[PDB]
Amino acid sequence: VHLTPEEKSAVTALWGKVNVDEVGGEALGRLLVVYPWTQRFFESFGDLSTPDAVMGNPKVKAHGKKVLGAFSDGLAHLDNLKGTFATLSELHCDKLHVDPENFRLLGNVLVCVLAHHFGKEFTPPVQAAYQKVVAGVANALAHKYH
Amino acid sequence: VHLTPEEKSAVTALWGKVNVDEVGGEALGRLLVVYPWTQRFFESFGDLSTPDAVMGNPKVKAHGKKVLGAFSDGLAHLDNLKGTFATLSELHCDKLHVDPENFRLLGNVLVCVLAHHFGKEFTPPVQAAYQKVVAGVANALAHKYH
Amino acid sequence: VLSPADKTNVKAAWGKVGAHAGEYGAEALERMFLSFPTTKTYFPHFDLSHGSAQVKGHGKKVADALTNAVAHVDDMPNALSALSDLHAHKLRVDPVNFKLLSHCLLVTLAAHLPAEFTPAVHASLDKFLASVSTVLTSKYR
Amino acid sequence: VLSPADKTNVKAAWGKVGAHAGEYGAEALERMFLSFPTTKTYFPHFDLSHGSAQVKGHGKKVADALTNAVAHVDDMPNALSALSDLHAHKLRVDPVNFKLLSHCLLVTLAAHLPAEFTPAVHASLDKFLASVSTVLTSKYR
Ligand code: HEM
Ligand code: HEM
Ligand code: HEM
Ligand code: HEM
Ligand SMILES: O=P(O)(O)O[C@H]1[C@H](OP(=O)(O)O)[C@@H](OP(=O)(O)O)[C@H](OP(=O)(O)O)[C@@H](OP(=O)(O)O)[C@H]1OP(=O)(O)O
Numbered sequence: 001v002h003l004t005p006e007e008k009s010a011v012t013a014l015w016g017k018v019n020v021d022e023v024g025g026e027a028l029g030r031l032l033v034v035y036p037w038t039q040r041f042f043e044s045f046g047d048l049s050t051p052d053a054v055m056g057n058p059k060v061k062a063h064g065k066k067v068l069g070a071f072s073d074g075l076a077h078l079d080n081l082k083g084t085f086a087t088l089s090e091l092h093c094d095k096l097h098v099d100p101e102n103f104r105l106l107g108n109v110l111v112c113v114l115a116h117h118f119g120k121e122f123t124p125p126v127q128a129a130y131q132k133v134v135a136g137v138a139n140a141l142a143h144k145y146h
Numbered sequence: 147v148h149l150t151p152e153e154k155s156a157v158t159a160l161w162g163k164v165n166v167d168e169v170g171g172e173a174l175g176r177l178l179v180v181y182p183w184t185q186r187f188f189e190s191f192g193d194l195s196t197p198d199a200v201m202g203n204p205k206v207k208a209h210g211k212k213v214l215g216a217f218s219d220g221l222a223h224l225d226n227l228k229g230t231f232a233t234l235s236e237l238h239c240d241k242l243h244v245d246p247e248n249f250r251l252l253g254n255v256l257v258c259v260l261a262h263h264f265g266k267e268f269t270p271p272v273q274a275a276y277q278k279v280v281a282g283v284a285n286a287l288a289h290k291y292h
Numbered sequence: 293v294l295s296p297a298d299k300t301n302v303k304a305a306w307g308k309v310g311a312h313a314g315e316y317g318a319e320a321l322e323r324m325f326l327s328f329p330t331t332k333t334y335f336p337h338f339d340l341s342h343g344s345a346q347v348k349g350h351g352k353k354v355a356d357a358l359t360n361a362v363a364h365v366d367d368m369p370n371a372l373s374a375l376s377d378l379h380a381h382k383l384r385v386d387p388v389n390f391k392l393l394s395h396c397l398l399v400t401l402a403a404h405l406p407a408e409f410t411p412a413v414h415a416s417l418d419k420f421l422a423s424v425s426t427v428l429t430s431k432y433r
Numbered sequence: 434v435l436s437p438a439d440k441t442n443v444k445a446a447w448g449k450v451g452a453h454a455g456e457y458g459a460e461a462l463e464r465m466f467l468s469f470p471t472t473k474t475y476f477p478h479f480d481l482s483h484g485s486a487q488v489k490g491h492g493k494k495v496a497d498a499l500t501n502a503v504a505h506v507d508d509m510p511n512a513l514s515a516l517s518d519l520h521a522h523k524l525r526v527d528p529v530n531f532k533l534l535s536h537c538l539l540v541t542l543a544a545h546l547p548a549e550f551t552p553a554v555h556a557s558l559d560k561f562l563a564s565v566s567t568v569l570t571s572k573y574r
Contacts, residue, residue, distance in 0.1 A: 033552040034559050036433050037384035051553040097333040101386040108536055112555065115544035122544055124460070128467040145330050179411040180418050182574050183525035197412040243474045247527040254395055261402035262409050270319070273399060274326040291471055293571070419574060430434065433560060 001136035003078055007129040014118060014126060015075055023113055024068025025061035029054045031102075031109045038102055067106070074137055081140030089144030100142030107134030147224050147282030153275040154224055160264065160272060161221055169263065170214025171207035173256045175200045181251050187244060213252075220283050227286035235290035246288030253280025294416075294423060299365050301416030305401060305408045306362040313359055316400045318351025323396035331389055358397075361424050372427045380431035387432065390425035397421060435564060440506045442557030447503040449546050454500055457545060459492025461538040469533040475526055499538075502565045509568045521572035528570045535562035 003011065031038050033051045042048065045059040054060055070088060077084035092098045111130050115122040122130075149157065178185050179197045188194065191205040200206055216234060223230040238244040257276050261268040268276075294302070309316060324331050325340055338346040357375055364371035379385055398417055402409045409417075450457055465472050466481055466488075479487040498516055505512030520526055539558055543550040 030552050030555055034433075034556045037380075037386060040384035051551075051556065055552055093333070097336045099333045099386050099389070100330050101388050105386075111536075112539050112543045112550075115540045116547050116550055119544050119547060122540075124464040124467045127464050127540055131468040142330070145333075176411050176414060180415045180574075183521070183527065186525040197410070197415070201411055239474070243477045245474045245527045245530070246471050247529050257395075258398055258402045258409075258414060261399045262406055265403050265406060268399070268403050270323045270326045273323055273396075277327040288471070291474070415574070433434075433556070 001078060001081065001132050003129060003132055003136075007132065008078060010126050010129045011075065011078070011133055014114065014121065014130075015072070017118070018068075018072075018114075020068045020072055021065050023110075023117060024066070024071075025055075025064035026116075027106065027110045027113045028064030028067060029057070029060050030113060031106050032060060034109065035105050038105060041096065041098060041102075071110075071137060074140070075133070078133070078136070081136045082143055085137070085140040086144055089141050092141055093145045100138060100145060103138035103141045104135075107138050110134055147227055147278055149224060149275060149278055149282075153278065156272050156275045157221065157224075157279055160260065160267070160276075161218070164260070164263070166214045166218050167207075167211045169256075169259055170210035170212070170217075171201075172210070172262075173252060173259045174210035174213055175203070175206045176259060177248075177252050177255045178206065180255060184248055184251060187242065187248075217256075217283060220286070221279070224279070224282070227282050228289050231283070231286040232290055235287050238287060239291040246284060246291060249284035249287045250281075253284050256280055294365065294419060297412070298416040298419055301413045302362055302365065302420045305405060305413050305417055306359065308405055308408050309355075309401065312404065313355035314348070314352035316351075316397070316404060317353070317355030317358075318348045319403075320393060320397040320400040321347055321351050321354065323399055324393050327396065328389075328392040331392055334383070334385055334389070354393075358424065361420075361427070365420075368423060368427050369430070372424065376428050376431045379428045384432075387425075387429045390429060394418070394421035394425055435506060435560060438553070439557040439560055442554045443503055443506065443561045446542065446546060446549055446554050446558055447500065449549050450496075450542070453545070454496040455489070455493035456496075457492075457538070457541045458494070458496030458499070459489045461534065461541040462488050462492050462495070464540055465534050465537040468537065469530075472530055472533055475524070475530070495534075499565070502561075502568075506561075509564060510571070513565070513568050517569050517572045520569045525573075528566070528573065531562075531566035531570060535559070535566055538562060 029051075032042065032048055032054045039048050042060065042063070045057050045063070047053045048057065048060070074081050074084045092100070092103075111127060111134060114130060115127065175197075178188065178194055178200045182194075185194050188206070188209070191203060191209070193199040194203065194206070216231075220227055220230050228235075238246075238249075257273060257280060260276060261273065264272075306313075322342070325335075332340060335346075335350075338344065338350070340347065357372065361368045361371055369376075398414065398421065401417060402414070447454075463483070466476075473481055476487075476491075479485065479491070481488065498513065501512055502509055510517075539555065539562065542558060543555070
């Protein structure tokens with residue numbers, strides 16, 4: 001991605017301050033809460049009936065950190081999200097049947113979680129760079145769909 | 147635009163049969179009739195008050211022909227949409243201020259127009275190839291926006 | 293909102309569709325699967341091969357539902373509430389997908405009703421499908 | 434479809450914005466222009482520069498229409514007809530842009546009302562901006 005270096009530097013720096021555990025559970029929980037139809041893939045997590053039920057859910061929370069974990073590595077390969085997510089791309093496609101529109105929804109949730117977290121520091125320009133990242137990630141993850 | 151070769155012959159084969167002049171006036175007039183907010187760019191074209199005012203409007207027809215002619219030339223450079231359309235990209239951005247979403251609408255209208263014209267001949271796989279082409283052209287046109 | 297003309301346009305084009313509705317439904321779905329392959333993630337359980345009976349069977353179902361919305365053009369929220377419930381709560385199809393099928397249905401009709409598929413009818417039809425899609429996703433959250 | 438909780442949720446959130454609403458409006462615009470540069474095609478006559486007086490001016494107007502929608506949660510259509518008219522017949526902003534500006538306002542709120550920007554509140558505001566978007570684009574065709 002057409003991340004500019006001041007852009008790439010901007011991403012990297014905030015990212016470094018991220019508690020993946022927490023940001024990953026928060027991101028996945030908020031997705032399930034704001035866009036309830038995304039719950040369709042997580043029936044097995046249990047109870048998602050309420051925002052508290054969702055936010056509290058340990059596996060939502062454990063799947064949130066694993067998803068952010070994977071995201072976090074892609075940030076090492078910004079250069080190449082595509083080859084960095086190819087296998088995850090096929091997986092999401094061939095085994096999980098996840099519509100890639102979900103990746104977009106998670107991306108935007110993530111940006112809201114980061115602003116929430118970093119307030120002040122998650123400036124328009126830093127948001128612009130992350131927007132480009134989350135869009136890049138969604139595209140690399142959707143790339144192997146067929 | 148990464149099209150199978152099988153996808154570009156298909157594209158190329160059909161295209162071979164289009165009357166650009168006429169299809170260009172039809173796709174542009176339909177755009178303005180079906181998505182009337184797109185009339186915002188053509189105040190100077192006169193009367194777009196009704197479907198016949200739009201469709202038979204000689205400036206709509208004349209513009210339709212230049213738009214499709216430009217599209218028509220992109221079809222010869224599938225390999226390099228983005229270079230092919232860069233100066234048009236910048237013009238639409240810097241001078242005309244066209245939101246690139248308009249390029250996507252026109253691409254869909256265009257697909258409906260080819261279907262209307264070719265009927266049965268516009269098969270599902272021929273449509274899938276044109277879907278990639280018009281998406282490729284909208285992306286090339288949106289490429290230099292900033 | 294659907295104007296009187298829109299409604300006239302839609303009853304007219306849908307009238308002509310007539311007996312073919314199912315076959316157009318099944319073709320609209322194939323078009324969709326082919327042009328927007330991500331829509332296939334919702335039909336992992338279907339035979340999505342050309343001429344798949346699951347597809348032919350599903351196309352009629354979709355075509356019947358649209359015929360029913362046309363039949364109740366003045367009460368679609370209610371005519372389709374069961375299908376809104378279905379899609380909201382069980383299927384959970386992301387909303388963007390409705391636009392993709394709408395578009396492939398418009399293409400299908402264009403491909404089959406050249407004399408009817410005029411600019412004004414095309415305008416009415418798109419507004420109709422957008423209305424049906426809005427109805428189907430109205431209970432999502 | 435704004436539930437009772439939603440409305441209470443937005444009234445709350447909106448309630449804490451209070452005199453910073455014009456500020457958050459201008460910030461939300463700024464974020465949109467930087468994150469989604471295509472949105473700038475609607476403001477060629479604006480000085481889109483950082484802390485531009487037009488951008489601040491506009492931020493306020495938009496912030497004031499949201500406040501009004503919040504006050505009239507119950508009767509948006511009405512509360513905002515002038516504004517749907519305006520956007521439908523004069524501005525003619527493409528409807529995809531409403532999603533971008535709504536996102537930028539959610540991001541603006543979260544960044545500033547972290548306590549209050551709860552998963553539930555967040556869900557409520559998203560639905561809220563979505564229906565405002567809907568109202569504003571209802572008369573387009
Ligand atoms: C946005 C970036 C995403 C990344 C980097 C990502 C990454 C991952 C990873 C690393 C796994 C574990 C794969 C495995 O080891 O089996 C996984 C599994 C999974 N993901 Fe994604 N994912 C993303 C988004 C999403 C979204 C938005 C959804 C649906 C709302 C989703 C649905 C799933 C499901 C249902 C599984 C299987 C969970 C299980 O095994 O129970 N993913 N994902
Ligand atoms: C396939 C996509 C398109 C292509 C290849 C295309 C191509 C062209 C060309 C060749 C010109 C003339 C350039 C010049 O004057 O120097 C032009 C002008 C223009 N285009 Fe596009 N265009 C496309 C889509 C659109 C759409 C969808 C809209 C808005 C709905 C639009 C709005 C305009 C306007 C407003 C003008 C200037 C007309 C005038 O006052 O002379 N274009 N375009
Ligand atoms: C306005 C457009 C649509 C109409 C009228 C429609 C109508 C229907 C109908 C009548 C059914 C069968 C429910 C039953 O068993 O009675 C159904 C099921 C279903 N629909 Fe929709 N639908 C639409 C849009 C979509 C879209 C865009 C998608 C995904 C891309 C989708 C995915 C599904 C799936 C996966 C099922 C169940 C199929 C099965 O397991 O048999 N629908 N729909
Ligand atoms: C959240 C939804 C929105 C609200 C509440 C809103 C509200 C408003 C308000 C209050 C005005 C000033 C009207 C007056 O002069 O009295 C306005 C004008 C305007 N809006 Fe919207 N708007 C929204 C979405 C958008 C979007 C998404 C865009 C485009 C990216 C847009 C573009 C414009 C433009 C170009 C003007 C005219 C500005 C000028 O020339 O001064 N609006 N809107
Ligand atoms: O970032 P952009 O300049 O907008 O273009 C990138 C990509 O380039 P990279 O692989 O170098 O990031 C490709 O553009 P071209 O090389 O064809 O110009 C193309 O990706 P595909 O090869 O997968 O098509 C796609 O642009 P578009 O969709 O406009 O064709 C887009 O990739 P992303 O959207 O995944 O960033």
